[PDB]
Design a protein around this ligand. Structure first.
Ligand code: NA
Length: 162
């Protein structure tokens, strides 16, 4: 649809953890299973082939027997430095995640997260209605990723105490 536009989410987090510890959260299966679109208790399946061009597949338990399936690809993996991945399998577009890890002087890491997602324009939508749907979608994604990263934060914290 020539008319579908992207929302973009930009998130900066500062952690005391080393870039290596944060990068690991993104690239290790039994860590990702705890935070990335899933959690320890709701995770049904996770497969992750963590190399460039490799697939991941997360099945997450929702209410009343329903399931969420999340699949995508690692496009770029540079050690302690950079992950580019898709949400969506190259019906329905791929969202893009690009996340960079920088070492601070002081802390462990500055984490710079970028996300791009195509929002579908509905039949007969006014300019305002479309703009309102992208704003709602953006705020929902900001909130869902915040909740994820702060979950990711405790998963990292509890490998540091246990
Ligand atoms: Na997906």
């Amino acid at each position: 649809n020539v008319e579908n536009e992207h929302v973009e989410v930009e998130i900066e987090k500062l952690y005391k953890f080393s870039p290596e510890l944060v990068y690991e959260a993104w690239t290790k299966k039994d860590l990702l299973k705890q935070w990335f679109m899933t959690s320890a208790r709701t995770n049904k399946e996770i497969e992750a082939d963590v190399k460039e061009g490799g697939k991941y597949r997360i099945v997450d338990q929702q209410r009343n027997g329903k399931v969420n399936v999340i699949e995508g690809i690692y496009e770029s993996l540079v050690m302690d430095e950079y992950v580019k991945m898709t949400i969506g399998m190259p019906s329905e577009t791929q969202d893009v995640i690009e996340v960079e890890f920088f070492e601070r002087e002081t802390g462990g890491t500055q984490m710079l997260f970028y996300y791009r997602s195509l929002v579908e324009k509905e039949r007969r939508f006014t300019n305002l209605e479309y703009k309102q749907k992208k704003k709602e979608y953006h705020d929902a994604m900001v909130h869902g990723f915040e909740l994820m990263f702060d979950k990711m934060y405790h998963v990292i914290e509890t490998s540091t105490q246990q």
